[PDB]
Amino acid sequence: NILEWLENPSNTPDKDYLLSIPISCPLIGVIQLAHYVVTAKLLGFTPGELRSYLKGATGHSQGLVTAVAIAETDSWESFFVSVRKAITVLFFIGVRCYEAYPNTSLPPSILEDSLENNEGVPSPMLSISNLTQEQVQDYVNKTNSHLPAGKQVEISLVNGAKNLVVSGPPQSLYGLNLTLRKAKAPSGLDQSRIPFSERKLKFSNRFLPVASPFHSHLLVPASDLINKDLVKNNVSFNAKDIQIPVYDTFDGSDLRVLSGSISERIVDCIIRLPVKWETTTQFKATHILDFGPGGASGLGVLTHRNKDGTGVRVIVAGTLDINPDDDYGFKQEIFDVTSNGLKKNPNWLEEYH
């Protein structure tokens, strides 16, 4: 009962129930679509007009559903059709992926140990920073050598050069975290008097605020159920109706060009295949609009970090705020009619040629 929670902030469920995917996926989609609608209306555009002003669209994991829905919109009188399509896809993904791998209680000793060692509350996804994929895969391989096939972990998101997320059962990721804790150096440790080659690796790790192991082998059995539900509910995406290229999260290719079912591919990308953000974002552009959730701690800022120095500007389209370094934009930038609306980031090769 979303409207009741919105009008009455006290009848709203607790945070953990809101974070479960059968709730989370549809509501994140709704948030993205609401931001898109606000952006279009404040600019006087129909959704088709705003889409036409775009050169392309894409999404990080779940956002791929919203991106395709946006690419199909034409007029305000038919926007709810694509809204229904996207929300239905997200609803069925959430329901079937929660039925495939529901969460269960964690032994309190594990939570106590994680909290004592300044680690997050364990969850089905662990983000690792400052390590390369090669390195993280070696650790994952050694951890998987002991676990059985159904408790394996794997690299789910390649968010950057030294930014990776590993998905799997919360306890397998806790064991991986123990192994990593036995391979890290304290942040305080000064190594200024140690030759560079001999210095120990300082790298971060934390559990993400999520409630399902996405892009993992655990959710595969939900794929057929989701595809049957989408068919029974008459939800499909036709390449002739997508008017801007939508980039696949696994290989960065145009989904329109793909021959099979686009919805099946999107579901496969969300639940099974890993996400390579850089391969997907290898497109050329001067500006990137982030309608996602999370404000300045979301997808837009990560992409900015990955594309710094290449003259690409990122605007967080879902938040109004002032950035001190002004290295990325906020909601005000999209509607500013003066020159401050158009801000370009530095391309070093050209600026210091």
Partner 1 sequence: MKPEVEQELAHILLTELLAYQFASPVRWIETQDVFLKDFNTERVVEIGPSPTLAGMAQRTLKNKYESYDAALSLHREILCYSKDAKEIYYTPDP
Partner 2 sequence: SIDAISQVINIAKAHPNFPIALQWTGGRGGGHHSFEDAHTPMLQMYSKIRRHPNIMLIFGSGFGSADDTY
Partner 3 sequence: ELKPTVILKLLKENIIQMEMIENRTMDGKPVSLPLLYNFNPDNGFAPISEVMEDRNQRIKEMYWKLWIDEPFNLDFDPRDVIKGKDFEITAKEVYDFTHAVGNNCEDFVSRPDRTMLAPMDFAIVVGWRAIIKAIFPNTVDGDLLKLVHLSNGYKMIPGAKPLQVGDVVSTTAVIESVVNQPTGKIVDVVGTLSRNGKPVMEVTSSFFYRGNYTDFENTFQKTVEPVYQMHIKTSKDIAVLRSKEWFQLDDEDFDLLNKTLTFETETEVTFKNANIFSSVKCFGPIKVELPTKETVEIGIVDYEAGASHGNPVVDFLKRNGSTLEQKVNLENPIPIAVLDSYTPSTNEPYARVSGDLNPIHVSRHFASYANLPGTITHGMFSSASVRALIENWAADSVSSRVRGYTCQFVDMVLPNTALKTSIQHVGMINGRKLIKFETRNEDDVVVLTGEAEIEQPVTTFVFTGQGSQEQGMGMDLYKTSKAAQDVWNRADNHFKDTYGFSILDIVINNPVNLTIHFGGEKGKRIRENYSAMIFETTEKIFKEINEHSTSYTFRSEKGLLSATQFTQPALTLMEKAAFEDLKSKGLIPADATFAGHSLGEYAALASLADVMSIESLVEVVFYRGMTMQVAVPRDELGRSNYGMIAINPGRVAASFSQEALQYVVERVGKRTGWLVEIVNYNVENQQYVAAGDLRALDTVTNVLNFIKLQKIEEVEGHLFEIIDEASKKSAVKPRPLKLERGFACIPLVGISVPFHSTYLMNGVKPFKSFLKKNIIKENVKVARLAGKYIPNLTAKPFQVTKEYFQDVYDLTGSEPIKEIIDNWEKYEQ
We find the least distance from the C-beta atom of residue 39 to partner 3, in angstroms, to be: 41
CB-wise, 105 or 197, nearer to partner 3?
A: 105
Number of residues that bind partner 1 (CB under 8 A): 16
Beta-strand ranges (E) seen in 24-140 are 125-129
CB-wise, 220 or 296, nearer to partner 3?
A: 220
Nearest Cα residue to 157 out of 299, 277, 298, 25: 277
Q: What angle do CA 238, 252, 287 make, to 5 degrees?
A: 95
**Residue 110 is a binding residue for partner 1 (CB under 8 A):** yes
CB-wise, 103 or 310, nearer to partner 3?
A: 103
Backbone angles phi, psi at 157, to 5 degrees: -125, 125
**Residue 341 is a binding residue for partner 3 (CB under 8 A):** no
Residue with tokens 């930014």: 163
**Residue 286 is a binding residue for partner 1 (CB under 8 A):** no
> Which residues are the active-site residues?
61
141-200 positions binding partner 3, by CB under 8 A: 148-150
149 binds, among partner 3, partner 1, partner 2, none (CB under 5 to 8 A by kind): partner 3
CA distance 328 to 237: 33
**What is the x/- site pattern for partner 1, positions 132-171, by CB under 8 A?**
----------xx-xxx-----------------------x
**Residue 325 is a binding residue for partner 2 (CB under 8 A):** yes
Type of residue found at 13: P
CA distance 155 to 201: 20
Backbone angles phi, psi at 187, to 5 degrees: -60, -40
The C-alpha torsion from 287 through 291 and 297 to 303, rounded to 10°, is -30
83-112 positions binding partner 3, by CB under 8 A: 102, 104-109
Backbone angles phi, psi at 18, to 5 degrees: -70, -25
**Residue 309 is a binding residue for partner 2 (CB under 8 A):** yes
264-293 positions binding partner 2, by CB under 8 A: none
Q: Is 158 helix (H, G, I), strand (E, B) or coil?
A: strand
CA distance 211 to 206: 14
We find the least distance from the C-beta atom of residue 192 to partner 2, in angstroms, to be: 6
**Around 270, how many Cα atoms within 13 Å sit in the side-chain half-sphere?**
28
We find the least distance from the C-beta atom of residue 166 to partner 2, in angstroms, to be: 25
Give the footprint of partner 3 on this chain (CB under 8 A): 102, 104-109, 148-150
Give the footprint of partner 2 on this chain (CB under 8 A): 192-196, 308-309, 325, 327, 346, 348, 351-352
